[PDB]
Each structure stands twice: as C-alpha cells, then as structure tokens.
C-alpha cells in the first residue's frame, strides 16, 4: 500500500525533524543569551567611558573657572 | 526493488523538504530577533551619546 | 543484507545532509552579509552624528572665546 | 519483511539525525563565531572613535581656555 509508504516516511520525517529542530533551537537560545551578555558588557564599558569623560570634563571646567 | 526504490526516494525528498523548511522557518525567527537586539543596541548607544553630548554643551555654554 | 541496509542508510544520510547544510549555509551567508551592512550603516550614522556635535562644540568654544 | 523494514527504519533515523545535527552544529559554530567577531569588531570600532573624540574635545578645552 502507498498508505504504508506514506505512513512509514512521515514517522521518519517527524522523528528526524523533531530531534534536529530541538537541538538547533537550544544552540540558537545559547547564542542569543551570549550575544545579549556581549551587548550589556559593551554598553557598561561605554557608560563608564562617559562617566570618566563627564567627570574629567567638569573637573577641567572647574579649574578654568577658578582663574 | 520497486518498493525499496519507492521508500528510499520518498524518505529522502520528505525528510530533506521538511527539515529545510522547519530550520528555515526557525532561522527566519532567530535572524529577525538577533537583528532587532542588534538595532536596539545601536538605538541604545545613539540615544546615550546624543543625551550626554547635549548635557556636555548645555554645561559648557551655561558655565561659560 | 546488513551491508545493503548499511549502504541505503549511508546514501539517504548523505543526500539529505548535503541538501540541508547547502541550505543552512546559503541562509547564514545572507544573514551574515545583512548584519555587516546593518553594522556599517549604523557606524556611518553614529559617525556623522559625532561630526555634527564636534562642529556645534567648536562653534560654541569659538563664541565663548569671542 | 517486518524485520528488514524495522532494521532499515531504525538505522535511517539514527544516522540521518546524528549526521544532520552534527553538520548543523559544525556550521553554527563557524557561523556564530563570525556574527560574534563582526559584533565586537564593530564595538571596538565605536570605542576607539569615542576614545579619540573625548581626547580631542579634552585637548581643545584645555588648549583654548586653560
């Protein structure tokens, strides 16, 4: 019967699909989390740069003024 | 053979067609999200640099 | 017998794999190429905007002087 | 022949799954690495620009007004 062929194929297609897409999902999650981490670390580094720069600037403005 | 040929060709097309599709669909959704957090990140930086430069100048002028 | 099963299995396995990877590769090529253009485009914006704020800045430090 | 069909069904599913997962894994590592490096190369890009910006802005104010 082509019913038996259709059926056996779909069983195999489903199992292979399920277990392939499950693994590729887990790998994509891990990559998403790690890129976010990367992004925050990047933002934090930048916001420190701005803090130091704003401070050094205001310090220098202050020294100009006191003259 | 007619059977084994039929089953073999069937399994191959079917697994290939459906795996490609399911990963593709899944990729479109991932590549969309990764591009958004990417642009969100740029929007974040931009807005922060805009604001701090505006505060720098408004400082400078106002103090001098 | 098993050799035959084993042979059908290596054939199916390789036909599928080659087709799937040849697909997820071409896909990853597009996305890579697109995140690069987005990355550079976003760099060009931030740079212009810094130029514009350096000009405003010099204009200001030029007036404070006058 | 149930034993033959069974035998063939098991091996195809194990092997196709094993072979595909492994290739995509391999493709993904190579692929993820290149997103991640392009990403940090872009962040470095911004950083060295802000370092140089802030440094020039600093030098101007001190040279002009101090």
Residue numbers in the entry:
A (entry chain C): 110 to 176
B (entry chain D): 111 to 174
C (entry chain A), D (entry chain B): 110 to 175
Publication text:
Here, I report the crystal structure of the TubY C-terminal coiled-coil domain of the pXO1-like plasmid pBc10987 from Bacillus cereus. Sequence analyses revealed that BcYN and BcYCΔ contain the HTH motif and coiled-coil domains, respectively. I determined the crystal structure of BcYCΔ. The asymmetric unit contains four BcYCΔ monomers, which forms a tetrameric four-helix bundle with dimensions 90 Å × 20 Å × 20 Å. These four monomers are parallel and related by a pseudo-2-fold axis, and the root-mean-square deviation (rmsd) of Cα atoms (residues 112–174 of chain A and B versus C and D) is 0.37 Å. The BcYCΔ structure reveals that the hydrophobic core of the four-helix bundle is mostly aliphatic. Regarding BcY, BcYN is monomeric and incapable of binding to DNA, whereas BcYC is a tetrameric parallel coiled-coil with no cysteine or histidine residues. The crystal structure of the BcY C terminus revealed that the coiled-coil region is a parallel tetramerization domain, demonstrating that BcY is a unique tetrameric MerR-like transcriptional regulator. The results of this study show that oligomerization enables efficient binding of BcY to DNA. GFP-BcYtail was not localized to the cell periphery, indicating that a single BcYtail peptide is not sufficient for the membrane attachment, and that tetramerization by the BcYCΔ region increases the affinity of BcYtail for lipid membranes.
